[PDB]
Amino acid sequence: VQREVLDLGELISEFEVLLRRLLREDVKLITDYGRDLPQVRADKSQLETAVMNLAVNARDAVRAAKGGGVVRIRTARLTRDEAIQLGFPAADGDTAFIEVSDDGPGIPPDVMGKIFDPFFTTKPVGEGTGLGLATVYGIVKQSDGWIHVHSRPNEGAAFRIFLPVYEAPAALEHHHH
Ligand SMILES: Nc1nc2c(ncn2[C@@H]2O[C@@H]3COP(=O)(O)O[C@H]4[C@@H](O)[C@H](n5cnc6c(=O)[nH]c(N)nc65)O[C@@H]4COP(=O)(O)O[C@H]3[C@H]2O)c(=O)[nH]1
Ligand SMILES: Nc1ncnc2c1ncn2[C@@H]1O[C@H](COP(=O)(O)OP(=O)(O)NP(=O)(O)O)[C@@H](O)[C@H]1O
Ligand SMILES: [Mg+2]
C-alpha cells in the first residue's frame, strides 16, 4: 500500500482519458464533476483499479445497446445528509463521492446480495474470473470507505464509493494512549 494525498478531480479526469481508450465507442461515457472537489488519502493505483473494474462492468451491462448505452462517472463533495441519502448511513460530515452509473438492465434483486462474492459471475465459463467486484470491495474498505449499490431492473445500476475527506489543515488526531 502506497497511500498518498490525491485531488479527486485530478484523479478521475486524468484517468478518464485512459478509460475512454479502454472502452472505445462501446458506450457513451459521460462525466459530472462537482465543484470544490475534496482531497482524499488512498493508494492511487488501487482506486484506479476499482474505478476501472466498475466502468468495464457498466460497459458489459449495456453491450446489448450496441453503442447507445450510457455510463457516467460522477464525482462530488457531498454534505453529511446527501451521503446518508445516497446510501452511506454512517456519514459524519462532508464526504468524497465517486459513482459509476449506467442505464443498463440493472441487478436482479436475487443476485444483489452475492455480487461482491469472490467468483460470482453471470458470464460464461471462458470470460473473466468473477473477482472484479470482490477486488473493488476490498479496495474501498482498504481506503476506509463505504460502497453502496443502487439498482433495480429498469433502473440501471449505480455503484457509489464514499471516501473520507482529507484536510491537510486538520489537526493531528492524538491521545494519551
Ligand atoms: N479477518 C477478516 N475479517 C474480515 C474480512 N472481511 C471482513 N471482515 C470483518 O468481518 C466483519 C463482518 O463483515 P460482513 O459480514 O461483510 O458485515 C459487514 C457488512 O454487512 C457491512 N459493510 C461494511 N462495509 C460495507 C460497505 O462498504 N458496503 C456495504 N453495502 N456494506 C458494508 O457492515 C458489516 C460490518 O462491517 P465491519 O465493521 O467492517 O466488520 C467486518 C470486518 O470486521 C476478512 O477477509 N478477514
Ligand atoms: N453495472 C452492472 N449492471 C448489472 N450487473 C452487474 C453490474 N456490475 C456487476 N454486475 C453483476 O455482478 C457480476 C459480478 O461482477 P464482477 O465481480 O466484476 O465479475 P464479472 O464482471 O462477471 N467478470 P470479471 O470482472 O472479468 O472478473 C457480473 O457478472 C454481473 O452479473
Ligand atoms: Mg467485472
PDB file of C-alpha atoms and ligand atoms in Angstrom:
ATOM      1  CA  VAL A   1       0.000   0.000   0.000  1.00  0.00           C
ATOM      2  CA  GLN A   2       1.353   3.383  -1.138  1.00  0.00           C
ATOM      3  CA  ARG A   3      -1.177   5.870   0.266  1.00  0.00           C
ATOM      4  CA  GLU A   4      -0.928   9.453  -0.893  1.00  0.00           C
ATOM      5  CA  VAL A   5      -2.944  12.670  -0.806  1.00  0.00           C
ATOM      6  CA  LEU A   6      -4.946  12.838  -4.048  1.00  0.00           C
ATOM      7  CA  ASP A   7      -7.139  15.510  -5.618  1.00  0.00           C
ATOM      8  CA  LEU A   8     -10.342  13.647  -6.504  1.00  0.00           C
ATOM      9  CA  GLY A   9     -10.927  15.745  -9.645  1.00  0.00           C
ATOM     10  CA  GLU A  10      -7.412  15.263 -10.983  1.00  0.00           C
ATOM     11  CA  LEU A  11      -7.561  11.532 -10.205  1.00  0.00           C
ATOM     12  CA  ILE A  12     -10.706  10.878 -12.255  1.00  0.00           C
ATOM     13  CA  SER A  13     -10.152  13.433 -15.069  1.00  0.00           C
ATOM     14  CA  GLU A  14      -6.644  12.176 -15.814  1.00  0.00           C
ATOM     15  CA  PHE A  15      -7.791   8.554 -15.657  1.00  0.00           C
ATOM     16  CA  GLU A  16     -10.867   9.294 -17.835  1.00  0.00           C
ATOM     17  CA  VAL A  17      -8.623   9.728 -20.884  1.00  0.00           C
ATOM     18  CA  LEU A  18      -7.124   6.237 -20.422  1.00  0.00           C
ATOM     19  CA  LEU A  19     -10.578   4.793 -19.649  1.00  0.00           C
ATOM     20  CA  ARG A  20     -12.048   6.176 -22.909  1.00  0.00           C
ATOM     21  CA  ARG A  21      -9.329   4.263 -24.814  1.00  0.00           C
ATOM     22  CA  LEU A  22     -10.225   1.048 -22.997  1.00  0.00           C
ATOM     23  CA  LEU A  23     -13.982   1.486 -23.680  1.00  0.00           C
ATOM     24  CA  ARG A  24     -13.699   2.794 -27.348  1.00  0.00           C
ATOM     25  CA  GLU A  25     -17.270   3.562 -28.648  1.00  0.00           C
ATOM     26  CA  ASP A  26     -18.834   0.548 -26.858  1.00  0.00           C
ATOM     27  CA  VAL A  27     -20.578   3.090 -24.628  1.00  0.00           C
ATOM     28  CA  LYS A  28     -21.150   6.807 -24.418  1.00  0.00           C
ATOM     29  CA  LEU A  29     -19.035   7.662 -21.356  1.00  0.00           C
ATOM     30  CA  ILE A  30     -20.211  10.844 -19.606  1.00  0.00           C
ATOM     31  CA  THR A  31     -18.981  12.788 -16.631  1.00  0.00           C
ATOM     32  CA  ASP A  32     -20.273  15.010 -13.943  1.00  0.00           C
ATOM     33  CA  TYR A  33     -17.552  16.680 -11.821  1.00  0.00           C
ATOM     34  CA  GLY A  34     -18.881  18.544  -8.830  1.00  0.00           C
ATOM     35  CA  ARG A  35     -17.433  21.872  -7.712  1.00  0.00           C
ATOM     36  CA  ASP A  36     -14.899  22.319  -4.873  1.00  0.00           C
ATOM     37  CA  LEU A  37     -13.833  18.672  -5.000  1.00  0.00           C
ATOM     38  CA  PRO A  38     -12.108  17.337  -1.875  1.00  0.00           C
ATOM     39  CA  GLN A  39      -8.763  15.646  -1.409  1.00  0.00           C
ATOM     40  CA  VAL A  40      -8.631  12.011  -0.241  1.00  0.00           C
ATOM     41  CA  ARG A  41      -5.893   9.702   1.097  1.00  0.00           C
ATOM     42  CA  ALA A  42      -5.641   6.484  -0.839  1.00  0.00           C
ATOM     43  CA  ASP A  43      -3.464   4.263  -2.949  1.00  0.00           C
ATOM     44  CA  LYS A  44      -3.845   5.837  -6.419  1.00  0.00           C
ATOM     45  CA  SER A  45      -3.327   2.660  -8.478  1.00  0.00           C
ATOM     46  CA  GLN A  46      -5.837   0.790  -6.278  1.00  0.00           C
ATOM     47  CA  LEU A  47      -8.541   3.481  -6.731  1.00  0.00           C
ATOM     48  CA  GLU A  48      -7.881   3.474 -10.469  1.00  0.00           C
ATOM     49  CA  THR A  49      -8.314  -0.335 -10.473  1.00  0.00           C
ATOM     50  CA  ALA A  50     -11.600  -0.016  -8.557  1.00  0.00           C
ATOM     51  CA  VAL A  51     -12.991   2.626 -10.947  1.00  0.00           C
ATOM     52  CA  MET A  52     -11.785   0.631 -13.965  1.00  0.00           C
ATOM     53  CA  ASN A  53     -13.483  -2.570 -12.740  1.00  0.00           C
ATOM     54  CA  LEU A  54     -16.760  -0.678 -12.229  1.00  0.00           C
ATOM     55  CA  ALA A  55     -16.510   1.041 -15.641  1.00  0.00           C
ATOM     56  CA  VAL A  56     -15.934  -2.267 -17.519  1.00  0.00           C
ATOM     57  CA  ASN A  57     -18.902  -3.817 -15.642  1.00  0.00           C
ATOM     58  CA  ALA A  58     -21.035  -0.881 -16.784  1.00  0.00           C
ATOM     59  CA  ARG A  59     -19.823  -1.442 -20.354  1.00  0.00           C
ATOM     60  CA  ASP A  60     -20.634  -5.166 -20.112  1.00  0.00           C
ATOM     61  CA  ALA A  61     -24.116  -4.379 -18.758  1.00  0.00           C
ATOM     62  CA  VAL A  62     -25.008  -2.002 -21.644  1.00  0.00           C
ATOM     63  CA  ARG A  63     -23.364  -4.062 -24.508  1.00  0.00           C
ATOM     64  CA  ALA A  64     -26.731  -5.085 -25.964  1.00  0.00           C
ATOM     65  CA  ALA A  65     -27.383  -1.402 -26.787  1.00  0.00           C
ATOM     66  CA  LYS A  66     -24.506  -1.681 -29.362  1.00  0.00           C
ATOM     67  CA  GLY A  67     -23.100   1.838 -28.943  1.00  0.00           C
ATOM     68  CA  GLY A  68     -26.121   3.564 -27.350  1.00  0.00           C
ATOM     69  CA  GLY A  69     -25.645   2.567 -23.669  1.00  0.00           C
ATOM     70  CA  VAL A  70     -24.547   5.302 -21.291  1.00  0.00           C
ATOM     71  CA  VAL A  71     -22.047   5.027 -18.442  1.00  0.00           C
ATOM     72  CA  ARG A  72     -21.468   8.003 -16.152  1.00  0.00           C
ATOM     73  CA  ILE A  73     -18.593   8.632 -13.779  1.00  0.00           C
ATOM     74  CA  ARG A  74     -19.680  11.252 -11.230  1.00  0.00           C
ATOM     75  CA  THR A  75     -17.545  12.943  -8.556  1.00  0.00           C
ATOM     76  CA  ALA A  76     -18.587  15.264  -5.775  1.00  0.00           C
ATOM     77  CA  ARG A  77     -18.182  16.703  -2.346  1.00  0.00           C
ATOM     78  CA  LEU A  78     -21.317  15.587  -0.518  1.00  0.00           C
ATOM     79  CA  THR A  79     -22.783  17.004   2.662  1.00  0.00           C
ATOM     80  CA  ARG A  80     -23.398  14.547   5.510  1.00  0.00           C
ATOM     81  CA  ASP A  81     -27.118  14.466   4.676  1.00  0.00           C
ATOM     82  CA  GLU A  82     -26.524  13.887   0.944  1.00  0.00           C
ATOM     83  CA  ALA A  83     -24.159  10.995   1.722  1.00  0.00           C
ATOM     84  CA  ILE A  84     -26.754   9.354   4.013  1.00  0.00           C
ATOM     85  CA  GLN A  85     -29.411   9.895   1.342  1.00  0.00           C
ATOM     86  CA  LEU A  86     -27.145   8.278  -1.321  1.00  0.00           C
ATOM     87  CA  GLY A  87     -26.562   5.181   0.900  1.00  0.00           C
ATOM     88  CA  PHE A  88     -23.761   5.829   3.435  1.00  0.00           C
ATOM     89  CA  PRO A  89     -25.587   5.548   6.796  1.00  0.00           C
ATOM     90  CA  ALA A  90     -22.552   6.366   8.998  1.00  0.00           C
ATOM     91  CA  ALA A  91     -21.581   9.616   7.197  1.00  0.00           C
ATOM     92  CA  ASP A  92     -20.344  12.100   9.847  1.00  0.00           C
ATOM     93  CA  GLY A  93     -19.558  15.228   7.763  1.00  0.00           C
ATOM     94  CA  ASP A  94     -18.543  16.274   4.230  1.00  0.00           C
ATOM     95  CA  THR A  95     -17.787  13.118   2.198  1.00  0.00           C
ATOM     96  CA  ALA A  96     -15.874  12.403  -1.055  1.00  0.00           C
ATOM     97  CA  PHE A  97     -18.051  10.686  -3.685  1.00  0.00           C
ATOM     98  CA  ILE A  98     -17.141   8.584  -6.737  1.00  0.00           C
ATOM     99  CA  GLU A  99     -20.048   6.956  -8.587  1.00  0.00           C
ATOM    100  CA  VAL A 100     -20.119   4.739 -11.663  1.00  0.00           C
ATOM    101  CA  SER A 101     -23.623   4.579 -13.107  1.00  0.00           C
ATOM    102  CA  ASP A 102     -25.211   3.030 -16.169  1.00  0.00           C
ATOM    103  CA  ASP A 103     -28.575   2.800 -17.894  1.00  0.00           C
ATOM    104  CA  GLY A 104     -28.318  -0.963 -18.380  1.00  0.00           C
ATOM    105  CA  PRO A 105     -30.715  -3.694 -17.223  1.00  0.00           C
ATOM    106  CA  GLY A 106     -29.810  -3.346 -13.534  1.00  0.00           C
ATOM    107  CA  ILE A 107     -29.115  -6.041 -10.975  1.00  0.00           C
ATOM    108  CA  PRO A 108     -31.819  -8.629 -10.258  1.00  0.00           C
ATOM    109  CA  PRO A 109     -32.800  -8.494  -6.531  1.00  0.00           C
ATOM    110  CA  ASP A 110     -31.959 -12.227  -6.110  1.00  0.00           C
ATOM    111  CA  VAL A 111     -28.409 -11.516  -7.421  1.00  0.00           C
ATOM    112  CA  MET A 112     -27.744  -8.307  -5.451  1.00  0.00           C
ATOM    113  CA  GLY A 113     -26.630  -9.990  -2.218  1.00  0.00           C
ATOM    114  CA  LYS A 114     -23.854 -12.021  -3.924  1.00  0.00           C
ATOM    115  CA  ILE A 115     -22.316  -9.589  -6.479  1.00  0.00           C
ATOM    116  CA  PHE A 116     -19.302  -8.869  -4.228  1.00  0.00           C
ATOM    117  CA  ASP A 117     -18.617 -12.596  -3.635  1.00  0.00           C
ATOM    118  CA  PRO A 118     -15.300 -13.843  -4.995  1.00  0.00           C
ATOM    119  CA  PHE A 119     -16.013 -15.693  -8.247  1.00  0.00           C
ATOM    120  CA  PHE A 120     -19.705 -14.750  -8.605  1.00  0.00           C
ATOM    121  CA  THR A 121     -20.449 -14.023 -12.294  1.00  0.00           C
ATOM    122  CA  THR A 122     -23.284 -14.189 -14.831  1.00  0.00           C
ATOM    123  CA  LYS A 123     -20.795 -14.567 -17.736  1.00  0.00           C
ATOM    124  CA  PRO A 124     -19.993 -17.898 -19.450  1.00  0.00           C
ATOM    125  CA  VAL A 125     -17.093 -20.055 -18.225  1.00  0.00           C
ATOM    126  CA  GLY A 126     -14.425 -18.718 -20.615  1.00  0.00           C
ATOM    127  CA  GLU A 127     -14.893 -14.971 -19.915  1.00  0.00           C
ATOM    128  CA  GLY A 128     -13.304 -13.328 -16.833  1.00  0.00           C
ATOM    129  CA  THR A 129     -12.865 -14.645 -13.298  1.00  0.00           C
ATOM    130  CA  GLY A 130     -15.689 -13.089 -11.276  1.00  0.00           C
ATOM    131  CA  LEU A 131     -13.286 -11.207  -8.989  1.00  0.00           C
ATOM    132  CA  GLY A 132     -13.883  -7.664 -10.351  1.00  0.00           C
ATOM    133  CA  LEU A 133     -16.294  -6.599  -7.598  1.00  0.00           C
ATOM    134  CA  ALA A 134     -14.525  -8.558  -4.829  1.00  0.00           C
ATOM    135  CA  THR A 135     -11.435  -6.510  -5.723  1.00  0.00           C
ATOM    136  CA  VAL A 136     -13.491  -3.280  -5.757  1.00  0.00           C
ATOM    137  CA  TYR A 137     -14.978  -4.074  -2.335  1.00  0.00           C
ATOM    138  CA  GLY A 138     -11.585  -4.828  -0.833  1.00  0.00           C
ATOM    139  CA  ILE A 139     -10.087  -1.601  -2.248  1.00  0.00           C
ATOM    140  CA  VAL A 140     -12.942   0.523  -0.871  1.00  0.00           C
ATOM    141  CA  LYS A 141     -12.511  -0.977   2.623  1.00  0.00           C
ATOM    142  CA  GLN A 142      -8.674  -0.573   2.461  1.00  0.00           C
ATOM    143  CA  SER A 143      -9.324   3.117   1.658  1.00  0.00           C
ATOM    144  CA  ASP A 144     -11.505   3.453   4.841  1.00  0.00           C
ATOM    145  CA  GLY A 145     -14.508   3.843   2.572  1.00  0.00           C
ATOM    146  CA  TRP A 146     -18.045   2.599   2.044  1.00  0.00           C
ATOM    147  CA  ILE A 147     -19.693   1.277  -1.120  1.00  0.00           C
ATOM    148  CA  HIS A 148     -23.435   1.291  -1.790  1.00  0.00           C
ATOM    149  CA  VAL A 149     -25.189  -0.191  -4.820  1.00  0.00           C
ATOM    150  CA  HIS A 150     -28.454   1.331  -6.085  1.00  0.00           C
ATOM    151  CA  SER A 151     -30.115  -0.751  -8.800  1.00  0.00           C
ATOM    152  CA  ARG A 152     -33.441  -2.187  -9.771  1.00  0.00           C
ATOM    153  CA  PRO A 153     -34.476  -3.811 -13.076  1.00  0.00           C
ATOM    154  CA  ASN A 154     -35.444  -0.854 -15.338  1.00  0.00           C
ATOM    155  CA  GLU A 155     -33.403   1.467 -13.114  1.00  0.00           C
ATOM    156  CA  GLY A 156     -29.776   0.884 -14.342  1.00  0.00           C
ATOM    157  CA  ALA A 157     -27.078   0.357 -11.713  1.00  0.00           C
ATOM    158  CA  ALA A 158     -25.133   2.925  -9.669  1.00  0.00           C
ATOM    159  CA  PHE A 159     -22.053   1.906  -7.692  1.00  0.00           C
ATOM    160  CA  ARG A 160     -21.285   4.602  -5.157  1.00  0.00           C
ATOM    161  CA  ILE A 161     -17.943   4.915  -3.341  1.00  0.00           C
ATOM    162  CA  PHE A 162     -17.799   7.189  -0.296  1.00  0.00           C
ATOM    163  CA  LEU A 163     -14.338   8.163   0.986  1.00  0.00           C
ATOM    164  CA  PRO A 164     -13.220  10.354   3.900  1.00  0.00           C
ATOM    165  CA  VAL A 165     -12.316  13.935   3.007  1.00  0.00           C
ATOM    166  CA  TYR A 166      -8.653  14.570   3.747  1.00  0.00           C
ATOM    167  CA  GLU A 167      -7.906  18.056   5.027  1.00  0.00           C
ATOM    168  CA  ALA A 168      -4.222  18.987   5.256  1.00  0.00           C
ATOM    169  CA  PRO A 169      -5.133  21.803   7.746  1.00  0.00           C
ATOM    170  CA  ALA A 170      -6.789  19.344  10.173  1.00  0.00           C
ATOM    171  CA  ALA A 171      -5.011  18.949  13.493  1.00  0.00           C
ATOM    172  CA  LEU A 172      -3.362  15.607  14.164  1.00  0.00           C
ATOM    173  CA  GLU A 173      -5.719  13.199  15.895  1.00  0.00           C
ATOM    174  CA  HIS A 174      -3.955  12.027  19.093  1.00  0.00           C
ATOM    175  CA  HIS A 175      -4.476  10.565  22.534  1.00  0.00           C
ATOM    176  CA  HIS A 176      -2.575   9.754  25.767  1.00  0.00           C
ATOM    177  CA  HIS A 177      -2.501   6.205  24.872  1.00  0.00           C
TER     178      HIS A 177
HETATM  179  N1  LIG B   1     -10.211 -11.394   9.360  1.00  0.00           N
HETATM  180  C1  LIG B   1     -11.038 -10.908   8.405  1.00  0.00           C
HETATM  181  N2  LIG B   1     -12.081 -10.119   8.805  1.00  0.00           N
HETATM  182  C2  LIG B   1     -12.936  -9.627   7.885  1.00  0.00           C
HETATM  183  C3  LIG B   1     -12.745  -9.917   6.460  1.00  0.00           C
HETATM  184  N3  LIG B   1     -13.719  -9.282   5.784  1.00  0.00           N
HETATM  185  C4  LIG B   1     -14.486  -8.657   6.704  1.00  0.00           C
HETATM  186  N4  LIG B   1     -14.001  -8.859   7.946  1.00  0.00           N
HETATM  187  C5  LIG B   1     -14.593  -8.404   9.223  1.00  0.00           C
HETATM  188  O1  LIG B   1     -15.859  -9.067   9.206  1.00  0.00           O
HETATM  189  C6  LIG B   1     -16.873  -8.187   9.664  1.00  0.00           C
HETATM  190  C7  LIG B   1     -18.221  -8.590   9.102  1.00  0.00           C
HETATM  191  O2  LIG B   1     -18.261  -8.374   7.703  1.00  0.00           O
HETATM  192  P1  LIG B   1     -19.652  -8.500   6.912  1.00  0.00           P
HETATM  193  O3  LIG B   1     -20.364  -9.792   7.241  1.00  0.00           O
HETATM  194  O4  LIG B   1     -19.399  -8.127   5.465  1.00  0.00           O
HETATM  195  O5  LIG B   1     -20.568  -7.358   7.570  1.00  0.00           O
HETATM  196  C8  LIG B   1     -20.408  -6.019   7.178  1.00  0.00           C
HETATM  197  C9  LIG B   1     -21.334  -5.650   6.059  1.00  0.00           C
HETATM  198  O6  LIG B   1     -22.646  -6.229   6.202  1.00  0.00           O
HETATM  199  C10 LIG B   1     -21.439  -4.160   6.239  1.00  0.00           C
HETATM  200  N5  LIG B   1     -20.500  -3.360   5.431  1.00  0.00           N
HETATM  201  C11 LIG B   1     -19.266  -2.935   5.801  1.00  0.00           C
HETATM  202  N6  LIG B   1     -18.734  -2.155   4.834  1.00  0.00           N
HETATM  203  C12 LIG B   1     -19.661  -2.069   3.851  1.00  0.00           C
HETATM  204  C13 LIG B   1     -19.749  -1.373   2.552  1.00  0.00           C
HETATM  205  O7  LIG B   1     -18.784  -0.693   2.164  1.00  0.00           O
HETATM  206  N7  LIG B   1     -20.877  -1.510   1.829  1.00  0.00           N
HETATM  207  C14 LIG B   1     -21.925  -2.259   2.249  1.00  0.00           C
HETATM  208  N8  LIG B   1     -23.015  -2.352   1.466  1.00  0.00           N
HETATM  209  N9  LIG B   1     -21.910  -2.919   3.443  1.00  0.00           N
HETATM  210  C15 LIG B   1     -20.827  -2.838   4.256  1.00  0.00           C
HETATM  211  O8  LIG B   1     -21.158  -3.836   7.613  1.00  0.00           O
HETATM  212  C16 LIG B   1     -20.814  -5.047   8.290  1.00  0.00           C
HETATM  213  C17 LIG B   1     -19.728  -4.837   9.331  1.00  0.00           C
HETATM  214  O9  LIG B   1     -18.509  -4.445   8.703  1.00  0.00           O
HETATM  215  P2  LIG B   1     -17.156  -4.313   9.543  1.00  0.00           P
HETATM  216  O10 LIG B   1     -17.423  -3.445  10.731  1.00  0.00           O
HETATM  217  O11 LIG B   1     -16.058  -3.996   8.555  1.00  0.00           O
HETATM  218  O12 LIG B   1     -16.962  -5.811  10.109  1.00  0.00           O
HETATM  219  C18 LIG B   1     -16.385  -6.807   9.259  1.00  0.00           C
HETATM  220  C19 LIG B   1     -14.888  -6.935   9.415  1.00  0.00           C
HETATM  221  O13 LIG B   1     -14.503  -6.651  10.753  1.00  0.00           O
HETATM  222  C20 LIG B   1     -11.594 -10.765   6.107  1.00  0.00           C
HETATM  223  O14 LIG B   1     -11.377 -11.040   4.905  1.00  0.00           O
HETATM  224  N10 LIG B   1     -10.808 -11.207   7.104  1.00  0.00           N
HETATM  225  N1  LIG B   2     -23.327  -2.416 -13.728  1.00  0.00           N
HETATM  226  C1  LIG B   2     -23.857  -3.651 -13.605  1.00  0.00           C
HETATM  227  N2  LIG B   2     -25.090  -3.958 -14.062  1.00  0.00           N
HETATM  228  C2  LIG B   2     -25.636  -5.185 -13.955  1.00  0.00           C
HETATM  229  N3  LIG B   2     -24.978  -6.210 -13.353  1.00  0.00           N
HETATM  230  C3  LIG B   2     -23.732  -6.027 -12.858  1.00  0.00           C
HETATM  231  C4  LIG B   2     -23.086  -4.719 -12.949  1.00  0.00           C
HETATM  232  N4  LIG B   2     -21.877  -4.831 -12.382  1.00  0.00           N
HETATM  233  C5  LIG B   2     -21.746  -6.097 -11.966  1.00  0.00           C
HETATM  234  N5  LIG B   2     -22.855  -6.806 -12.251  1.00  0.00           N
HETATM  235  C6  LIG B   2     -23.114  -8.222 -11.955  1.00  0.00           C
HETATM  236  O1  LIG B   2     -22.184  -8.674 -10.983  1.00  0.00           O
HETATM  237  C7  LIG B   2     -21.408  -9.732 -11.528  1.00  0.00           C
HETATM  238  C8  LIG B   2     -20.018  -9.725 -10.904  1.00  0.00           C
HETATM  239  O2  LIG B   2     -19.206  -8.699 -11.448  1.00  0.00           O
HETATM  240  P1  LIG B   2     -17.605  -8.849 -11.364  1.00  0.00           P
HETATM  241  O3  LIG B   2     -17.233  -9.217  -9.969  1.00  0.00           O
HETATM  242  O4  LIG B   2     -16.983  -7.639 -11.986  1.00  0.00           O
HETATM  243  O5  LIG B   2     -17.362 -10.151 -12.275  1.00  0.00           O
HETATM  244  P2  LIG B   2     -17.582 -10.241 -13.880  1.00  0.00           P
HETATM  245  O6  LIG B   2     -17.724  -8.869 -14.450  1.00  0.00           O
HETATM  246  O7  LIG B   2     -18.670 -11.232 -14.164  1.00  0.00           O
HETATM  247  N6  LIG B   2     -16.110 -10.921 -14.513  1.00  0.00           N
HETATM  248  P3  LIG B   2     -14.617 -10.070 -14.291  1.00  0.00           P
HETATM  249  O8  LIG B   2     -14.892  -8.675 -13.785  1.00  0.00           O
HETATM  250  O9  LIG B   2     -13.974 -10.182 -15.616  1.00  0.00           O
HETATM  251  O10 LIG B   2     -13.807 -10.850 -13.278  1.00  0.00           O
HETATM  252  C9  LIG B   2     -21.483  -9.556 -13.033  1.00  0.00           C
HETATM  253  O11 LIG B   2     -21.230 -10.763 -13.765  1.00  0.00           O
HETATM  254  C10 LIG B   2     -22.900  -9.069 -13.194  1.00  0.00           C
HETATM  255  O12 LIG B   2     -23.809 -10.166 -13.176  1.00  0.00           O
HETATM  256 MG    MG B   3     -16.360  -7.400 -13.949  1.00  0.00          MG
END
